[PDB]
Symmetry: C4
Subunit: 388 residues, 4 copies
């Protein structure tokens, strides 16, 4: 077994093809299934796994009540093979109300954060054993990506924030070797707020498209140099912006450098990736709510400030259905590195008040160099059929 | 580990022996079990797996209502070890309302089709990663075998159709290497409608017995040359015909070349294979409905137009019990390739209206060179005991 | 991987120590657990497995009603790791209302019998594929051991009967190489009725202690020569007899050669094994009913007709609790071959009529060369707590 | 694979970081989950497992009633991967109402005790087979650690007691090679009552901190010489004592040599380990009841009689929540041996009488050389939501 380097070109793609779906909520109405949120996907060199933050309860369970709330001590990181829904034999990998995981070619790293808001602990578990930990540096909800971290030549990197969710905060980039923090770099460059980064290998570095929860409806970028630990940051050029909320397409803007101050407050975890001057990205279809999900390529979306010319759109979830978080994961093929993504499909609170819980299912698509058609792959549960 | 060649002679058989049965529907009345249809079996070089298309729900579950419907976004391909029923720990391999899977000696290939009727997408997943995709070429429900594909020396072939289910359609034969489509051949020969092929290795090529849903109650054949990608097609010679509906045995015909125009419209997935001039086949016992199941050898059934002399009959399911689809799968032995088959045992709608769902169990038999007796192995559930 | 020879001396033991217990019926009252009977245990070179004949249903399931009946097409052979109860993820290895399984050092053989009483089929599955089959030779419930078969140097042997359960029948001993029947020997010697043999390796041969369901409350012996396929048979010498029903200890007899004609009709599967002139054996505590279970060594119990001197008794299940079948299995240690045994603990019908099902749990003990105390390890379920 | 030696230095730690939590009781209100108590954790060289003693029943199950009782024949040792809750697919490793397990680098050893109070049997299962057994030597509830044993160079040691729980008893130290007892050493030194030892490797020997249930609220120590089998014993020097019940910190004493005769009778399983002259320990926060849990380092707590200066305290469970047993386990790192611990979180009887069962969940922490914050990780179930 060898370390992953991801030293292959990115796969040239034409769009995305359907890959997985777990039907969690449909199943929860006739089965013992975990209440979750903040899912993601990551693969070792052989196979893929779905992850999510449990709420220490199943859905058909009185403990499901009140699970809209983000942080309790009972939240743990669930990890199954992709497509295996979160049944009672699911392994709870660690204690976490925020997490990130990645495989370095040899073993799994999990970054797991739990404890008091003002004084949380992040544990670093590598190859099944606790190797390191770090306490909160700003005493205000230490937190991380809620998607996969990225490792090159045995060094994994992960982005963490501590501080205000609606103002300047303290963001740092950790470099981790076999679970041991070997270096920490502060955020640097022009991004002014970093949450929930969706990162991906871009040899010889790592690149993240994140969420600005303060002043930007355009998505921040963080670039991580794995050779000298230097950090840069900016914003996605595309004038078709990825965050929710956001201005409609005719009145939205980005200059690649600063937050746009267009319905900038709040956000949703998301992703995009560069292809030369172009940008593949996803976002919700609704500009104000976490409804629908669409992908497309923005021509000049990486290089050209305020580009709004798109091509190769695909509906993933139609705008009559709830979406939520989305993130990227990368998969090594024979000659190139492919990009895939997942979409969290949130059911229950706050939008659907018939029930007293909040949970999600997922749908997963991968990059393709072939052809495809159309469809819509929503959660599929009838809210009226669910235990409340 | 090496690529399968299947370069051994076909096992000489005297009939078939009982192999597996999952009791899905009986279990569903006291357990959380997936609603399914369109099952099949395929084995890697070590062990066998059962597959089926889930309906994104369990049976004792209000989402079971309306599962007679064929195509929804929530259908996924389930894969367990043969004999493990579809419990909540079952892995959803991909998104699929039509599928085919096969193992090439090294890894699994799954062909999974989902999306809009008029614009579907087929994903090609090999060794746990999406390698290729293709969109609909006739904008009318792109679809495939619902049984195993076949691979020789690293090339796997699968048969797909797009177009009318009651008229001329567009059928193509794909050749796939490690998930990557390397060549596509149009249907050629005298078969005029091809659905749901049951294929098997017949070194150096592959042979399929399929379903003609337009003008034939006799079963089409498709022969696939793996060396030059050429295709040929015809119909099963036997005057004892395998489709349902069909004429009774006294007024049924086949000339090996054309659809017989005898109750030709509609059909059911099925199988047969050749042994020299003779034919082993199965079919429903009823000639109008999907009731019962029987196998037999037809003397001259492969080489002689309209042969009706059978021998070595076996009841698999008696005619008081519901059957459904059936397909072949091949298992490599020490010195020969054996042929096995599965029968889908459909319960619920449209035949049984006490319940509002449609699901199935399976029963599985393998060729034997030994001896055997008699029996009947139906689904076994009491419809009156089921959740509605 | 090499073939097992079992060419080590038998472990000298002082009694038996507790090994496993599955609590199936206690669990069935709050969980989805298979209805079973006819359990047994067998181990490959690394680990042990429990087996049982399912009834194609869980206990808390209306299909549980009527499961006192022995043979339906829905019965299949369940196989889990020992101590894993029969939950919904249990693999159904084959179709069987009677079975035997063993591992030859390389792979598992399963002998599975199903179909019509008058014309049953036995399938032989080796290394996950059907290799052979045989039909009924006397048209009267072809049947086998309901415990492990035994393999030496790649040849597995198994004892099967076809014919009357209350009169002379047709018993044959099969020799099976990688699932292929290479030879069949008729029963020979003085045993006049053979059912449900508990066999064990006794290098260079195999020895079985079985059940006489016609004229003997003493247990028949069958000796199998694996070098030339010759068969011998007799009866256990011990005047403390192993079958149920039987005469009380003061009025019971055996002469090592003929059935004793003492409450000979009926029986229960059981076991014993020789140690020089002595005999270790188990039986129910009740002489008339399947209640309690006890083991002991009978001094001269193998060599001396009608010996009644016992030593080293142990209660396994007290006589206030239901037992059932019991059988032997052998486990290779570093220098010797150990003998273990299981006891089936039957709950429900016919004895307990509050419920309409019949099922069992198991308890398992292994030979020890150390010391031990006392106890009683019954099923433990409160019949009044069970779904009916 | 090689025998563990544990010949690395103890990891220098600053405290403990969150590692795992199973949420057993919360899940039990919407799922079929085993009733347990007496949990622990032990890891093979690759991964960690949670263990516990089942009560032969699930919680939502009428057999849960009366599970406050300690010893029944239906108790079995459960073993899952750490983080997998005790669902119906959990393996019952052996019959046990008291146990200890450990992995010697090659295979697992389980020590399992069951049977009559006055005449119990301990089985020694190694590598999936029963290798040895021993009967009770004092006819008064033979019993062992309820946490992991320790193996160095192929010899595993475990501490057992037989005799009064409120008076002088007979304690012995067994040395076991591949399941076989090779030597037994009587307790020696100044410890006067030894229960439920929490042992750890301290190369070249093993050290245990145990429970004195007769006259000590301070914790006994047992030191085991693996080279010559000699034993020594004493008490933990720290004047901050670890047992419950105990005197408050102002009136508590220990002289390192004798039980302190301060609320000495009764107790609770616990742990501590030395680092030079200092002591890391945990205990309940309440001094009279099994409520809360806290850890801290005591400066001079190992070497200095009656030291009461603590540093680096951490709340694990706050004093509004129920705790219970706790024990140590050791995890080998790249360059040092780390110490982790688990806390049993007892719910139901005797403290919570709304329900008629007694069960537990766990929370697990591992030593860290990094930093951390604060929190509280209790069981988390609402007793009012539970099945009674
Ligand atoms: C069958 O499926 C195929 C593949 O999905 C599908 O082809 C795709 O159609 C879409 C929609 O036309 C194309 O994406 C568009 O590209 C144009 C540039 O030529 C853009 O202008 C579009 O964006 C505008 O329109 C969108 C609405 O469609 C708005 O949401 C958006 O804000 C813009 O105003 C859009 O990006 C896509 O390129 C093709 N894909 C390929 C590979 O050709 C085809 O249409 C389907 N057939 C049928 C009959 O439905
Ligand atoms: C015990 O089991 C064995 C094995 O199953 C069984 O032997 C089989 O019997 C069947 C039925 O007789 C044989 O199959 C027949 O073969 C003749 C040709 O010799 C055909 O004519 C038969 O077809 C006609 O009859 C069918 C009804 O049986 C009709 O459905 C059909 O349309 C035809 O008109 C049929 O193919 C078979 O060959 C044997 N198998 C062997 C290996 O001998 C035996 O009968 C069983 N005995 C009992 C008492 O159950
Ligand atoms: C603690 O446990 C140990 C180990 O189990 C136990 O020692 C065993 O006691 C039994 C019962 O006495 C012994 O078995 C007996 O052996 C004598 C020969 O000396 C036989 O005569 C006995 O058979 C007769 O009695 C039985 C009732 O006990 C009848 O059921 C039977 O039909 C006969 O009439 C019986 O075989 C056994 O040998 C010892 N085992 C050892 C290793 O010594 C001990 O008794 C237990 N201690 C207490 C206080 O319970
Ligand atoms: C954020 O988290 C960190 C890490 O947990 C935390 O720092 C820790 O605080 C505790 C409490 O002050 C420190 O532990 C104490 O150490 C002093 C000696 O310097 C002892 O006197 C303390 O014991 C006394 O007080 C206890 C109550 O706190 C009593 O229970 C006890 O009986 C004694 O009278 C105690 O051991 C600990 O050393 C630090 N850890 C580190 C690494 O600095 C910090 O306080 C947290 N901040 C907030 C705002 O939550
Ligand atoms: C879920 O919990 C909520 C909050 O505790 C419950 O809602 C409360 O119900 C009480 C009881 O009548 C009311 O008096 C409160 O005003 C409600 N609170 C709120 C915020 O609405 C609710 O009943 C629980 N639901 C279920 C299904 O158990
Ligand atoms: C399954 O779904 C069907 C269709 O929705 C339900 O049948 C309908 O029930 C409504 C009232 O609830 C009637 O007004 C319609 O006439 C019914 N439709 C048909 C076509 O019969 C049915 O109730 C559902 N079944 C269950 C068990 O919930
Ligand atoms: C289990 O099945 C049995 C047999 O079908 C049922 O017993 C019968 O019940 C009917 C209905 O009242 C009676 O008329 C018959 O006389 C009963 N038969 C016998 C043999 O006693 C029984 O009710 C079913 N039990 C359950 C729990 O479903
Ligand atoms: C759990 O078991 C207890 C003890 O059997 C039950 O309490 C007894 O109930 C009976 C009547 O059913 C009373 O006469 C006794 O006085 C009760 N005993 C005690 C000690 O209180 C209790 O009902 C059972 N609990 C449940 C939930 O079934
Ligand atoms: C605490 C700040 C943070 C980033 C904006 O809030 C997130 C947003 C929430 C989201 O907008 O739905 C869900 C996340 N569970 C939450 N993360 C944590 C650790 O609580
Ligand atoms: C759409 C044509 C096709 C071939 C006849 O219909 C099939 C027949 C159906 C029926 O004959 O049972 C079941 C299949 N689910 C359906 N396949 C799809 C993809 O919908
Ligand atoms: C059919 C004869 C046979 C041996 C006496 O009966 C067995 C006895 C029964 C037993 O006495 O309880 C149970 C077995 N399930 C049955 N075996 C079969 C195949 O039905
Ligand atoms: C029997 C003495 C022993 C040591 C104090 O009691 C333990 C204490 C009990 C209690 O302190 O929680 C729980 C244990 N289940 C019990 N062990 C056994 C084997 O019954
Ligand atoms: Ca924003
Ligand atoms: Ca047709
Ligand atoms: Ca008899
Ligand atoms: Ca004490």
């Amino acid at each position: 077994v060898e370390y992953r380097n991801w030293s292959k070109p990115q796969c040239q793609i034409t769009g995305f093809a359907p890959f997985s779906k777990d039907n969690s909520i449909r199943l929860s109405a006739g089965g013992d299934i975990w209440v979750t949120r903040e899912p993601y996907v990551s693969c070792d060199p052989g196979k893929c796994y779905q992850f999510a933050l449990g709420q220490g309860t199943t859905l058909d369970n009185k403990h499901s009540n009140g699970t809209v709330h983000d942080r309790i001590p009972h939240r743990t990181l669930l990890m199954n093979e992709l497509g295996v829904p979160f049944h009672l034999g699911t392994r709870q990998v660690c204690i976490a109300w925020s997490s990130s995981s990645c495989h370095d070619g040899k073993a799994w790293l999990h970054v797991c954060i739990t404890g008091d808001d003002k004084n949380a602990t992040a544990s670093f578990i590598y190859d099944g054993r606790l190797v390191d930990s770090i306490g909160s540096w700003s005493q205000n909800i230490l937190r991380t990506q809620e998607s996969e971290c990225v490792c090159i030549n045995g060094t994994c990197t992960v982005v963490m924030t501590d501080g205000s969710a609606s103002g300047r905060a303290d963001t740092r980039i950790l470099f981790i070797e076999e679970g041991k923090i070997v270096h920490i770099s502060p955020l640097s460059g022009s991004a002014q707020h970093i949450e929930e980064c969706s990162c991906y290998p871009r040899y010889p570095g790592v690149r993240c498209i994140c969420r600005d929860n303060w002043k930007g409806s355009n998505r921040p970028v963080v670039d991580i140099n794995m050779e000298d630990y230097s950090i840069d940051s900016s914003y996605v050029c595309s004038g078709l912006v990825g965050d929710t909320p956001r201005n409609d397409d005719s009145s939205s803007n980005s200059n690649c450098r600063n937050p746009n101050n267009e319905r900038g407050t709040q956000g949703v975890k998301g992703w995009a990736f560069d292809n030369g001057n172009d940008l593949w990205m996803g976002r919700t279809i609704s500009k104000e709510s976490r409804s629908g999900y669409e992908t497309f390529k923005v021509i000049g979306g990486w290089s050209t400030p305020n580009s709004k010319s798109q091509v190769n759109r695909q509906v993933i979830v139609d705008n009559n259905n709830w979406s939520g978080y989305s993130g990227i994961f990368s998969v090594e093929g024979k000659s190139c590195i492919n990009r895939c993504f997942y979409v969290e499909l949130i059911r229950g609170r706050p939008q659907e008040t018939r029930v007293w819980w909040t949970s999600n299912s997922i749908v997963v698509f991968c990059g393709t160099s072939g052809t495809y058609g159309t469809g819509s792959w929503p959660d599929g549960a009838n809210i009226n059929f669910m235990p409340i």
